[PDB]
Write a structure and sequence with these properties.
The structure is cut from a larger assembly and holds three copies of chain A.
Chain A (H helix, E strand, L loop, with lengths): L3 H10 L3 E4 L20 H15 L5 E5 L8 H13 L5 E2 L34 H5 L8 E6 L10 H10 L3 E6 L7 E4 L5 E4 L16
Parallel strand pairs in A: 1-2, 2-3, 4-5
Antiparallel strand pairs in A: 6-7
The complex binds a molecule of 2 linked components (BGC-GAL), magnesium ion (4 copies) and sodium ion (6 copies).
PDB class: hydrolase
Keywords: bi-functional enzyme, allolactose synthesis, TIM barrel (alpha/beta barrel), jelly-roll barrel, immunoglobulin, beta supersandwich, beta-galactosidase, glycosidase, hydrolase
Entry title: E. coli (lacZ) beta-galactosidase (G974A) in complex with allolactose
Amino acid sequence: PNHPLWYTLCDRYGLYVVDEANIETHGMVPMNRLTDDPRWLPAMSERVTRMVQRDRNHPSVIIWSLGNESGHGANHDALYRWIKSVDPSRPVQYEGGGADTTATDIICPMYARVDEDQPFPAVPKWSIKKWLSLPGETRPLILCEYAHAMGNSLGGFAKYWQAFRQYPRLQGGFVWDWVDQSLIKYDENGNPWSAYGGDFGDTPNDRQFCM
Amino acid sequence: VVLQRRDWENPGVTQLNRLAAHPPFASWRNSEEARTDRPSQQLRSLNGEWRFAWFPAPEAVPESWLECDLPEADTVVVPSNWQMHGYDAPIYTNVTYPITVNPPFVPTENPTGCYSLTFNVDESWLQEGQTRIIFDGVNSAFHLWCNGRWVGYGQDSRLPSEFDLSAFLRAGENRLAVMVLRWSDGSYLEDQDMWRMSGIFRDVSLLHKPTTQISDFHVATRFNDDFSRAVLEAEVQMCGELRDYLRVTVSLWQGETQVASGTAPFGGEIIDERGGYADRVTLRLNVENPKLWSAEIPNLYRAVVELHTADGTLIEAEACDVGFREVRIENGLLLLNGKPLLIRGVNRHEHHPLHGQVMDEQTMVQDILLMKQNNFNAVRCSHYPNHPLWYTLCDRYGLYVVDEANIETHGMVPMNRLTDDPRWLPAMSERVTRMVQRDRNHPSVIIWSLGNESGHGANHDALYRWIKSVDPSRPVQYEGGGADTTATDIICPMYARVDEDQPFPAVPKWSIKKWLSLPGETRPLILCEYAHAMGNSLGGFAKYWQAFRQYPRLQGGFVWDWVDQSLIKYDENGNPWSAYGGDFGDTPNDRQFCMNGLVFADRTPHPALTEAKHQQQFFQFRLSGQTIEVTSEYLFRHSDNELLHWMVALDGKPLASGEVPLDVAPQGKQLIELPELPQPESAGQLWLTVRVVQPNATAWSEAGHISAWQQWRLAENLSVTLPAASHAIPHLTTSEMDFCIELGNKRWQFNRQSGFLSQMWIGDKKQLLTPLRDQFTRAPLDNDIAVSEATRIDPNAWVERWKAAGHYQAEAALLQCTADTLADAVLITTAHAWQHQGKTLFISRKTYRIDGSGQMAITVDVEVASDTPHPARIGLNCQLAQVAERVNWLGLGPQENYPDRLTAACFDRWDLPLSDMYTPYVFPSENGLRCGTRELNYGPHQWRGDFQFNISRYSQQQLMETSHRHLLHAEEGTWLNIDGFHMGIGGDDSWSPSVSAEFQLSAGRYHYQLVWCQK
Amino acid sequence: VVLQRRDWENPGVTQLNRLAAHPPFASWRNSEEARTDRPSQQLRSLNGEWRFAWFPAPEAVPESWLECDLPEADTVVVPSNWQMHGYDAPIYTNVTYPITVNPPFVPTENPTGCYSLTFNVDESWLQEGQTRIIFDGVNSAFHLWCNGRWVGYGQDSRLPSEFDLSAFLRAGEN
Ligand SMILES: OC[C@H]1O[C@@H](OC[C@H]2O[C@@H](O)[C@H](O)[C@@H](O)[C@@H]2O)[C@H](O)[C@@H](O)[C@H]1O
Ligand SMILES: [Mg+2]
Ligand SMILES: [Mg+2]
Ligand SMILES: [Mg+2]
Ligand SMILES: [Mg+2]
Ligand code: NA
Ligand code: NA
Ligand code: NA
Ligand code: NA
Ligand code: NA
Ligand code: NA
């Protein structure tokens, strides 16, 4: 969840907001080790419930998200249902566990390609055009993350938009991401320069991947 | 810290240092012991004598108690409830919380039980592995210390709390200190309508596991379409250090035969982008033609889970009983093994009259045997997880179980105040999740329940989905918030009626037949509670069963409830008596409302139980000419332990009898052709009685067990032959005050001021202690009184309307009293008006005809004012002088039966001791009635006609005035009530009018006739 | 008690004495002010210059700090991240946790930011009603004291934690 002013500005300037719970357990093995564990339900529930209680009156918020990159656990299903019960006015989405689980109203993959399948075991990223028409699938597809804008990037961006325009149920996506996470450091001449992972003695680190 | 943190007033802390929940463990180090379920040396019981001290509050507990025994302490048996040892009072309240409603706070005067135990731990237990303590039940919250050091904290009174003691124990003598709080924030979720007690009330034990251990395992069974093939899937989890040489073997056993086995290293399938569970493995075993588990045939296999090394060294084994069965809802029907269930259920609290809420094997087995012997197949765990042995017995004897989370917030306003509050989600979630983790491997558990009477909150929806996600093998149900919310797979109302709607705002209870077909509704309906069996109750029970059988989607219900929650108290001579709310100084309280059972607290049956047995029969019957058609309501078993006994009798006199073996497929029919029946010489009604007998003993019944019966009227030959005219003629002696009739050593005296037969003489002996008068009232039943909360009165309750109309005050006023002499009889004619405050309620017009044979023919015609509440009865009563040993009658029996509860009773000649004609309900009321009686015999007396009667040493007046059975005194002589008509008893519920219209005395005018003679 | 219970290594405890969450409040005592979204006299900002001292662990924090200002502390801007002030290093890691994966435990060397503020409260605020403090964001967990007395605890770095200070405050300096 963002600084409270953010939602006030999106209300008044006009932007659709996905408001997302502060839950990410990416480094767990497997990813859902905590989110499938009932002992962690209480801590997870407060990150969801207190978000909804804070932000539910903001018109700019149109979709609730259960967090990011925490696999798919039973706690997700429980909290998904909690939101659906307390606030019918907004869809609920969540990408973890394959982007199309029982914990999401929207097929919301990250970095699924336009035409190319990536058939990873258990969590495949299908071509977005193909994903839509899988046997039994009826939901809309909106990428929660696509077009990774790292450095000299956004090749193939037009391929996404061509598909969004042609397919009714491909209703777009969220570019990753808005702003480089570089930090300012100062050299011996006092001159500011843009710094990334490792430049603060932080170790281990993932270098320029924050940009 | 412990005093400072006040964890018992924080719904955010429900435990400190508590271990994860899991299915029953024994940590066998021998696989054969695991297979055969023998005791385990690694699982030790700490039950027995502990030390105990009571304190008014936790602040009053002296610090020294942590380190050594209080000399003021007593030695007490554990498990126990401390109220049962007299340390403070048990409290009976229904809805209103026994504490001020101010969540999360509890009273500062918080009764505190200080338990301690000095015990030995062997060095071998501490040199290696993990030693944990297990508290299976502690009411309601507790802190634990071991050898003076704080270990942890636990809430939820109805599930086990476990703590690792490995770092706290020493070789030799150790001491546990357990501080148990009566009240905690957990109490807000524990508002079940029962005695409020506390203490260490379930088993305490120590379990040794190796450091490298089985930490969890789940057993699932999936099937093909015709159940000829099954896959057993066992997921196993470990704790400790992972090693490449580690293995898990799961073996399945049928008796002493191994049918399947699987072995694998640890390491689950990939589940996401980070891989899989390295500390888990899932074994899959194929089973061809498995023997299926049901309540009809509780076939069980044994699964053994072994943790071992690649080279064959066992580390430890765990095991459970496995029942191959599928539970699914399909097309609006609850199916078991592909067949629609008919739930013959009952709610059962864990209650003992001596031991409170402590459960034992003997009491459990006794309950299961009586349930099955009475055609029950299902039990609801109202309203909390049970003692672990309960499920093991239900697995093995065969009963379907609804396992229910320990959540009830009835007393909140509104009911969902906590359950819709996200602050109480953590506390609620633990009561659901830890139940599933414990009980999920039991085949007897077929339905999960989210609790009881906590309205419907968003927390329910979240926990509903949690269960659906972790365990798709079992439907989830929940009644709160109107019985058909989004948190329930089954429409599960409580006390919804068969035909009558009760349209309460927001939470209506529709007629169950109507409910099924509401627009958009597709689910099955099974009442979580129905037929409230409080005292003289279960009127209208047959109406439920007729409906269950006719409507596919009406799949039954659970009676409320099994056993009276009465407690034993002692008089000054040490004699025990049954006590209820208010008898322990407990206040406020809800009096007798804790007693709703089909059986007394000591498991003696109420009359209602036989009605339940009959209606819940597994064989149905029809008669067409000479043909009996027997239909089986079993789903799986052939009738391979059943024979039909038939009997034809003429007014109780056996004429013919035979037996035919039953060979009926499940759901099938068999036709039995009766032989040509010989025509009876005498006049009267021929009756056919059939009964189904089990020739062979079972695990649950003795040889010769009767499981079903039914009667039909056959040919009747009306008596046309007149009695030969008696020669003698009675004489009328008239005086100003009396009409006297004499015939030999027989006199009848009619008082002319009152208009009643005031006395009868056989020689010089008085026959009556009280004149024969009309009676229009009954000592009110619990259903009549209709109170669920002692404070609230329903002005619509029958007792209230009767009182307000003056039925219990009504004064007889004589209108007419004349005598006539006939050729061969004396005819007395009377008319009385019963009036209250100017208004005439009833008029009784009678004739008494006394002939030469000494028979008195009484004709009674009664008018009842249409605007007076329908009376409880229309009859006569008197106190007879005679006290005789036996009561003999031709009519419905042998047990107590009422107009809306007589289907189980059979018409025949019955002979009982007088005492059996009285039903000792703890709260006394009208009782012991027998209906459809044509002849009644007591001492020198005989009455003939078509009437209902009760006979006993207690007047309606005494029963009306006495609150407890033990306070009743035998009166002089015998009180006889003979009714031409008696109102239904009701019972659909016991807190509003529940007597169906067809059983109310609304006809306005009534006629009955009796003949009184000397036998 | 606070060092003993270690609430920051227990997922069962995500807060202590924290008030219920709610939508943004300003408690206007004038309706026209509420309509026009003008500043409320009942909603005050505590942003600005606070006092700050860094410690390697909570066990290294002196008890005196509860009662009075540490002379070794600095005056810093709040809101802030203390890495941006040079007190320790920001860490950039993608997937791998910046701490050993041993839930629910964290390192014993656990950088601890000791913030304090001396601030004034109008007497009118204490004569009636309820005065609460709102922390819109604290990363990653914190204990709160007011005038030396313990108030509460909170987790979740990205939502506000609110505490009733009504019984802890005096008129004038706090
Ligand atoms: O013995 C009653 C039995 O029924 C269930 O409901 C209790 C009953 O309480 C009354 O005060 C209310 O008016 C009524 O709404 C409610 O039905 C309960 O589930 C059982 O545990 C038990 O109390
Ligand atoms: Mg608590
Ligand atoms: Mg209740
Ligand atoms: Mg035994
Ligand atoms: Mg914590
Ligand atoms: Na589109
Ligand atoms: Na990145
Ligand atoms: Na049915
Ligand atoms: Na009751
Ligand atoms: Na048979
Ligand atoms: Na009575």
